[PDB]
A paper describes a structure:
Xylanases (endo-1,4-β-xylanases; EC 3.2.1.8) catalyze the hydrolysis of β-1,4-xylosidic bonds of xylan, constituting a class of enzymes that are critical for the degradation of hemicellulosic polysaccharides in biomass. Among these seven putative GH11 xylanases (Xyl11A, Xyl11B, Xyl11C, Xyl11D, Xyl11E, Xyl11F, and Xyl11G), Xyl11C (TcXylC) exhibited the highest specific activity toward xylan. The overall structure of TcXylCΔN17 shows a β-jelly roll fold, as seen in other GH11 family xylanases. The two catalytic residues, nucleophile Glu119 in β-sheet B6 and proton donor Glu210 in β-sheet B4, are located in this cleft.
The gene encoding the GH11 xylanase C (TcXylC) with the highest activity was used for overproduction and purification of the recombinant enzyme, permitting solving of the crystal structure to a resolution of 1.98 Å. The model of TcXylCΔN17 was able to be built from Gln34 to Ser223. The thumb in A close represents the close form (closed active site cleft), while the thumb in B open represents the open form (open active site cleft). The RMSDs of the Cα atoms between A close and B open were estimated to be 0.55 Å, and differences in conformational regions were observed between A close and B open. In the cleft of A close, 10 water molecules were observed, and a network of 31 hydrogen bonds were formed between the water molecules and 12 amino acid residues (Ser49, Asp78, Thr80, Tyr110, Trp112, Glu119, Tyr121, Arg155, Pro159, Tyr204, Ser208, and Glu210). In contrast, the cleft of B open included 7 water molecules and a network of 21 hydrogen bonds formed between the water molecules and 14 amino acid residues (Ser49, Thr80, Asn104, Tyr110, Trp112, Glu119, Tyr121, Pro131, Arg155, Gln169, Trp171, Tyr204, Ser208, and Glu210). On the other hand, in B open, the region from α-helix to B4 (residues 185–204) inclined at 5.4°, and the loop between B5 and B6 (residues 114–118) and cord wrapping thumb (residues 131–143) were spread at 1.4° and 2.8°, respectively, to outside of the enzyme by comparison with A close. Furthermore, because the values of B-factors of finger region in A close and thumb region in B open exhibit high values, these regions are able to fluctuate and are flexible. These results suggest that the tunnel has an open form in apo form as B open, and if the substrate binds to the active site cleft, the tunnel (close form) forms by replacing water molecules in A close. According to the superposition, TcXylCΔN17 has enough space to accommodate some branched sugar chain substrates.
Residue numbers in the entry: 34 to 223
């Protein structure tokens, strides 16, 4: 049922990943089908969500509720390997825009919205491969929204068209991530 330390697995047909670096209390609960719920209060950093692994650039439809007082992200979130990349298609966030001070590369239109595209390097940082160096790519929706359809293939295509290198898909989830914040989300992925 409800968990408080990091854990990955499969649940009702969905890959799920719950990662926390231990700070505050974060509680993660798998629901039915593609649903998950997470609630956090004064967290450190954590990421949580359902999706697929390995992913296949799914057109993802999600719905639900995401709220925070502080710094949190709602994004289609995953990784590639060879090369190693961490990426976000950021649909909503709280008090902090994570593209702040990142390199802007362009804009992409998809699913009725506009996203600005950014890249940064993460150097000797925690990863799905242990401590590693990798690029981190963002599509940040120019207006926040919680629910709709994300055609992740359009983002991946725009990133590569603009010159970003992408590897083989590893997991891809609809992630709630919190950072020094409190809040809650409940999200159904399909």
């Amino acid at each position: 049922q409800s968990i408080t330390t990091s854990q990955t697995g499969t649940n009702n047909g969905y890959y799920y990943s719950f990662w926390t670096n231990g700070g505050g209390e974060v509680t993660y609960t798998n629901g039915d089908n593609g649903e998950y719920s997470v609630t956090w209060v004064n967290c450190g950093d954590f990421t949580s969500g359902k999706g697929w692994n390995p992913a296949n650039a799914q057109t993802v439809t999600y719905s639900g509720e995401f709220n925070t007082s502080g710094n949190a992200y709602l994004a289609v979130y995953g990784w590639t390997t060879d090369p190693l990349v961490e990426y976000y298609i950021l649909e909503s966030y709280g008090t902090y825009n994570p593209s702040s001070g990142l390199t802007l590369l362009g804009q992409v239109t998809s699913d009725g919205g506009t996203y600005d595209i950014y890249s940064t390097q993460r150097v000797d940082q925690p990863s799905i491969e242990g401590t590693s160096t990798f690029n981190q790519y963002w599509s940040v929706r120019t207006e926040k929204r919680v629910g709709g359809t994300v055609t992740t293939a359009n983002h991946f295509a725009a990133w590569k068209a603009l010159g970003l290198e992408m590897g083989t898909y590893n997991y891809m989830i609809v992630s709630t991530e919190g950072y020094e914040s409190s809040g809650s989300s409940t999200i159904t992925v399909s």
